[PDB]
Amino acid sequence: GQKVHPIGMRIGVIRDWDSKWYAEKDYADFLHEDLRIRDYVAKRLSDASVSRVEIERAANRVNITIHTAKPGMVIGKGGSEVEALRKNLNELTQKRVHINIVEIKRADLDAKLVAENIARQLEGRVSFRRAQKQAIQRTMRAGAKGIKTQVSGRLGGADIARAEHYSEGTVPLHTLRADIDYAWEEADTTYGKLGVKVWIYRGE
RNA sequence: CGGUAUCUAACCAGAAAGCCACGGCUAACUACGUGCCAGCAGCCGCGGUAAUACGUAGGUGGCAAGCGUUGUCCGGAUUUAUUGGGCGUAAAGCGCGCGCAGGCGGUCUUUUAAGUCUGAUGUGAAAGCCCCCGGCUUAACCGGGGAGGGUCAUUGGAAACUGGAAGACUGGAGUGCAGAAGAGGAGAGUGGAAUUCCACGUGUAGCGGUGAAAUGCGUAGAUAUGUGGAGGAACACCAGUGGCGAAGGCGACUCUCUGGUCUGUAACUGACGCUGAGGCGCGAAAGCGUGGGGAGCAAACAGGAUUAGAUACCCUGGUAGUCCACGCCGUAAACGAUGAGUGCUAAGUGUUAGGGGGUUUCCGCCCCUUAGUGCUGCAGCUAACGCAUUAAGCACUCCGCCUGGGGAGUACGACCGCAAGGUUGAAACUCAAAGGAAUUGACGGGGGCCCGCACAAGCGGUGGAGCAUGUGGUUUAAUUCGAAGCAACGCGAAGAACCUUACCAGGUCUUGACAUCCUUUGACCACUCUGGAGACAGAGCUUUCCCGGGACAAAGUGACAGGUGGUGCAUGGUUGUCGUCAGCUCGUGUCGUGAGAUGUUGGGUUAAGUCCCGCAACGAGCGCAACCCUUGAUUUUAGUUGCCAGCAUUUAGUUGGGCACUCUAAAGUGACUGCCGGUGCAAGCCGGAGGAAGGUGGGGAUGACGUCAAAUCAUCAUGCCCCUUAUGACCUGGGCUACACACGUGCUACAAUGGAUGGUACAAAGGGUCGCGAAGCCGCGAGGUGGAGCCAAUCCCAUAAAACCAUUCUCAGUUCGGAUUGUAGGCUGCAACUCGCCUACAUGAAGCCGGAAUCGCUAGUAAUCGUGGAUCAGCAUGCCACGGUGAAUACGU
Ligand SMILES: [Mg+2]
Ligand SMILES: [Mg+2]
Ligand SMILES: [Mg+2]
Ligand SMILES: [Mg+2]
Ligand SMILES: [Mg+2]
Ligand SMILES: [Mg+2]
Ligand SMILES: [Mg+2]
Ligand SMILES: [Mg+2]
Ligand SMILES: [Mg+2]
Ligand SMILES: [Mg+2]
Ligand SMILES: [Mg+2]
Ligand SMILES: [Mg+2]
Ligand SMILES: [Mg+2]
Ligand SMILES: [Mg+2]
Ligand SMILES: [Mg+2]
Ligand SMILES: [Mg+2]
Ligand SMILES: [Mg+2]
Ligand SMILES: [Mg+2]
Ligand SMILES: [Mg+2]
Ligand SMILES: [Mg+2]
Ligand SMILES: [Mg+2]
Ligand SMILES: [Mg+2]
Ligand SMILES: [Mg+2]
Ligand SMILES: [Mg+2]
Ligand SMILES: [Mg+2]
Ligand SMILES: [Mg+2]
Ligand SMILES: [Mg+2]
Numbered sequence A: 001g002q003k004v005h006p007i008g009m010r011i012g013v014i015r016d017w018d019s020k021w022y023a024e025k026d027y028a029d030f031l032h033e034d035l036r037i038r039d040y041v042a043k044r045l046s047d048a049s050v051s052r053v054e055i056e057r058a059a060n061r062v063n064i065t066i067h068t069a070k071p072g073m074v075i076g077k078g079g080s081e082v083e084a085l086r087k088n089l090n091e092l093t094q095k096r097v098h099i100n101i102v103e104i105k106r107a108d109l110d111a112k113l114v115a116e117n118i119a120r121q122l123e124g125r126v127s128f129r130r131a132q133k134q135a136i137q138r139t140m141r142a143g144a145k146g147i148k149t150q151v152s153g154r155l156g157g158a159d160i161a162r163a164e165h166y167s168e169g170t171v172p173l174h175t176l177r178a179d180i181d182y183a184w185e186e187a188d189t190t191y192g193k194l195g196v197k198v199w200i201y202r203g204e
Numbered sequence B: 001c002g003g004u005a006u007c008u009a010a011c012c013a014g015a016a017a018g019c020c021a022c023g024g025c026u027a028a029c030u031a032c033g034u035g036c037c038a039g040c041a042g043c044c045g046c047g048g049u050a051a052u053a054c055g056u057a058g059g060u061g062g063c064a065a066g067c068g069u070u071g072u073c074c075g076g077a078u079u080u081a082u083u084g085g086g087c088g089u090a091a092a093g094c095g096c097g098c099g100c101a102g103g104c105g106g107u108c109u110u111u112u113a114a115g116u117c118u119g120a121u122g123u124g125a126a127a128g129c130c131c132c133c134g135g136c137u138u139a140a141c142c143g144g145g146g147a148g149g150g151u152c153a154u155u156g157g158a159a160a161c162u163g164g165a166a167g168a169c170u171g172g173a174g175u176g177c178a179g180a181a182g183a184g185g186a187g188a189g190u191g192g193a194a195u196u197c198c199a200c201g202u203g204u205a206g207c208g209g210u211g212a213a214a215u216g217c218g219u220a221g222a223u224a225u226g227u228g229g230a231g232g233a234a235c236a237c238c239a240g241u242g243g244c245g246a247a248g249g250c251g252a253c254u255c256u257c258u259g260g261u262c263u264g265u266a267a268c269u270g271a272c273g274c275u276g277a278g279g280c281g282c283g284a285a286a287g288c289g290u291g292g293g294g295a296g297c298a299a300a301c302a303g304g305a306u307u308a309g310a311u312a313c314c315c316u317g318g319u320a321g322u323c324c325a326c327g328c329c330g331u332a333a334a335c336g337a338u339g340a341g342u343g344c345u346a347a348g349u350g351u352u353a354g355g356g357g358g359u360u361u362c363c364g365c366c367c368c369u370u371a372g373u374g375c376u377g378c379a380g381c382u383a384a385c386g387c388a389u390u391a392a393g394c395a396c397u398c399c400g401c402c403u404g405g406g407g408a409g410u411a412c413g414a415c416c417g418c419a420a421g422g423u424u425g426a427a428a429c430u431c432a433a434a435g436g437a438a439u440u441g442a443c444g445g446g447g448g449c450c451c452g453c454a455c456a457a458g459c460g461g462u463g464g465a466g467c468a469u470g471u472g473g474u475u476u477a478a479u480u481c482g483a484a485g486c487a488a489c490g491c492g493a494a495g496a497a498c499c500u501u502a503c504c505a506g507g508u509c510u511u512g513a514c515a516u517c518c519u520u521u522g523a524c525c526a527c528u529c530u531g532g533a534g535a536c537a538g539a540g541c542u543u544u545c546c547c548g549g550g551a552c553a554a555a556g557u558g559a560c561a562g563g564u565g566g567u568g569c570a571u572g573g574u575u576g577u578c579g580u581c582a583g584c585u586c587g588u589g590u591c592g593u594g595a596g597a598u599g600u601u602g603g604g605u606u607a608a609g610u611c612c613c614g615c616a617a618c619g620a621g622c623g624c625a626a627c628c629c630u631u632g633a634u635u636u637u638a639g640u641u642g643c644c645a646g647c648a649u650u651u652a653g654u655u656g657g658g659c660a661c662u663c664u665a666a667a668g669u670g671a672c673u674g675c676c677g678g679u680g681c682a683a684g685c686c687g688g689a690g691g692a693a694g695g696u697g698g699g700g701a702u703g704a705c706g707u708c709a710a711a712u713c714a715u716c717a718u719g720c721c722c723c724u725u726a727u728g729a730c731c732u733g734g735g736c737u738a739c740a741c742a743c744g745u746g747c748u749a750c751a752a753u754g755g756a757u758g759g760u761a762c763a764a765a766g767g768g769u770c771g772c773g774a775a776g777c778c779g780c781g782a783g784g785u786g787g788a789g790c791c792a793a794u795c796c797c798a799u800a801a802a803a804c805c806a807u808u809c810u811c812a813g814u815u816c817g818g819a820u821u822g823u824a825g826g827c828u829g830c831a832a833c834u835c836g837c838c839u840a841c842a843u844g845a846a847g848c849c850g851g852a853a854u855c856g857c858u859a860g861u862a863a864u865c866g867u868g869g870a871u872c873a874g875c876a877u878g879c880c881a882c883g884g885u886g887a888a889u890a891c892g893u
């Protein structure tokens, strides 16, 4: 049995899609500009635990906000790394780009950030059983009513692939008033390719 | 022996370390090579292009002057069990009795001293094991002393136990006396139902048989029916986990001859007993010999059916046999799968044959007791099932039997038999299992409830024809690759003329078509001419960068790039399918030696493990339901590009005017078993009212744990393997469109509910800026010119078609059908031959409802008719959406 994408099921119902701009006859021109912007942000800020990026476009001006769990590298004492973004985005956007940075409180509640921390341990030769369990017990203190995660692929170096999942709490997928986050990430190993799936039933 | 052992003097780290294993058993793991090959192995078993198991290295682990392998013996092996096992179902109780030898044997007294216990003497050599000392520089090794070792011989004691002898007793055993029950056995005779045959009345056409039939019997008169005769076998009701017997077994009645058992008494004898190898007898059915008998039944056999075949099941016949006398045979799931004797160890309740007591006149009820026969259950036992005073519990005596499976109850030998065969009973070889009980699933041509267009009741199709399209096969330089029952086959492909294109022919390039870092200029090109099929080769105009920075470009080099090359059985992600089926699990608790179980089962109800009640369980999670969208009714907000009530005007809702009504879209109401009646205890069920809507209203989105090593390395990503002057890169042409053929999916028809001609009405949902494209004019037509308006509730696409109204055709291969083909055109595109779509004229094919088989659909559904959109320069009979008209049937499982 195949499951619908939990995020996609709730667009426009309880949540709102990330890129929120309106234009006609410039749709494909604007849309692929965003796909370029996201590609560069995900490159330089690979270790900054960045999860949510949205595009706010209005009359030749590009407004972008970055949701970061640890903005200290992104902004703070240096005060010069964030300005390089506007200098490294003017060449491809060709528009006056302003970037905003927003703190993420309780970073363990965000399904995006939990995903790579599980993932980063898998190529650190950590057992798959331990890595998931450690993240499950960390998020339950944050205030979530549900979590279940699986890791699938050539598991622990095994020749035959299989999946393993661990759950505790309440994760009702079929409920539409759920507010369930989702994230999928790649674990790059020397025996193959592994992927992790995490979804959290948030509080409200 | 022999200048041997042994001392002291000096020089030298210098001459002196190998063997086996590293998956588990079992201490010790990583690389490379190979790729079910080479090979390894004591067992389990490893090797099929990431091997801790094969080969070699590095490292490690056991020992060490060694270390491994083989052969033999003991151990582990309780696997011959005296110490120290067993026989209900795993191997293992003879089919049963009578009994010689042997083994074992109630209570007391006296005696004896064979067994039993004990002392002394003699001996059991030396060496060896063991204990205490001593010598070799230690040890091994060697001495001194001691100990142990016997069913040993002579002799002295003890008398409890077994044995011997002499007596005594009665709880064992047996006799006597008084009763009782019984299909216990052998012999002789008799009875009644019923079947068959025979003879004679009555009578007419079938009888008999099967899932259906047929063979067979009958007009030579059957079946049926009434009367009489002959003969053989078994004994209806009674009849009962009732009775009798050692077992096999014994069922009509009477008599004769016979065996055993139970109860009561306490007269009698006084251990006279239990088991019992060899031996001797009995012993279902079939079978054998001799003489009878023969009604039903029936191996063999014959015929008829069934079947792909049917030496069978089914039907019609039928010989030995079954019955009797005598004599053999000696087996059985001969079973309670449980040897015989004896004693002890909770209860509850039926029944057979007796005895005692209390109530009562009897009857009857109750209690106690003996011997049998059943059921339920404690302790105990058991691997479990289960047994449980009729033990598989606790004990003693005697007999029989067993030691992994097959070979095999076979071969040879012997005994027995008339024969068939019986009894006794191996080995070579081969395997690492064979087996008992219970658990979770699955399966059933087992059973009980249920659901789905599953069948049934209907309607319309496919399979027959022409064309469209995908696939197989085949042909081709190539016909690029993938999917293969449901769950590939108008599928990836929501568009193959060049591109796409992944394939082929020819022509070309090697840091390259695409990115990074090198170094000099900084713009680099573009264009024109020539050879050009083009890619590309040779010349000129210009290359203006901007701000020491830069991205690209010029130039050659490297690191490098590039693969739609392989493996979907190395993978991530994505999807199908069972199936929108109602299930799948967990936490704590409890039961079981254990795997497991319970919850999740039982009684109702539901679409639903949806809910209620009960319950050794109490709760939870993913699923169901609801929350989401859409349609159906309505209120407030809002009147523009929408609408026109009431108006004046216009060819026309037009213009002026107004949101009245529709309308559009934001917020709300509304449906929740809400209410009433009956039924039920509750869930719930049936009906009714209100309402637009009533029982999850209609339709969508939503697809649990998992199964198919299901599909995709070709959307993307990616481990390993492979190619790299090519398996990478550019150009033209061809091909993916072939064609004797087979299959799947569709379109059009085979006409009169129809064809043709003329007039006219009624929609919804969408698209439009390098776009839609009107009026007007032209052409028979496809189309051409033209440019209005529209960045759109405004303008265009855009006249909806079936339907309705008139005329004509008159049942024919036709005024049906349109394939096919010749000519003449239009449109896109640089280009329409391979290979596009449309128009005009002419040609006019198969086809007159489709065999076997098979598909879809339950209401605005099927059926039928039009419309729009994605991909798109052009091209859809495919796909995805929209509306018009609008059925038949559902008894039922
Ligand atoms: Mg000398
Ligand atoms: Mg010396
Ligand atoms: Mg020295
Ligand atoms: Mg070990
Ligand atoms: Mg290897
Ligand atoms: Mg080994
Ligand atoms: Mg090796
Ligand atoms: Mg080595
Ligand atoms: Mg060593
Ligand atoms: Mg030594
Ligand atoms: Mg040796
Ligand atoms: Mg040996
Ligand atoms: Mg032994
Ligand atoms: Mg045994
Ligand atoms: Mg026994
Ligand atoms: Mg057996
Ligand atoms: Mg047996
Ligand atoms: Mg017996
Ligand atoms: Mg005797
Ligand atoms: Mg005695
Ligand atoms: Mg004796
Ligand atoms: Mg001696
Ligand atoms: Mg000494
Ligand atoms: Mg000695
Ligand atoms: Mg000595
Ligand atoms: Mg005595
Ligand atoms: Mg004496």
Ligand SMILES: [Mg+2]
Pocket: none
């Ligand atoms: Mg007596």
Ligand SMILES: [Mg+2]
Pocket: none
């Ligand atoms: Mg008798």
Ligand SMILES: [Mg+2]
Pocket: B185
């Ligand atoms: Mg008799």
Ligand SMILES: [Mg+2]
Pocket: none
């Ligand atoms: Mg008679």
Ligand SMILES: [Mg+2]
Pocket: B212
């Ligand atoms: Mg028939």
Ligand SMILES: [Mg+2]
Pocket: none
């Ligand atoms: Mg007659």
Ligand SMILES: [Mg+2]
Pocket: none
């Ligand atoms: Mg008896």
Ligand SMILES: [Mg+2]
Pocket: B258, B259
């Ligand atoms: Mg008698």
Ligand SMILES: [Mg+2]
Pocket: none
């Ligand atoms: Mg008698």
Ligand SMILES: [Mg+2]
Pocket: B261, B262, B372
């Ligand atoms: Mg009796």
Ligand SMILES: [Mg+2]
Pocket: none
């Ligand atoms: Mg006497």
Ligand SMILES: [Mg+2]
Pocket: none
């Ligand atoms: Mg006896």
Ligand SMILES: [Mg+2]
Pocket: none
């Ligand atoms: Mg005998």
Ligand SMILES: [Mg+2]
Pocket: none
């Ligand atoms: Mg006989």
Ligand SMILES: [Mg+2]
Pocket: none
């Ligand atoms: Mg005979």
Ligand SMILES: [Mg+2]
Pocket: none
């Ligand atoms: Mg005879």
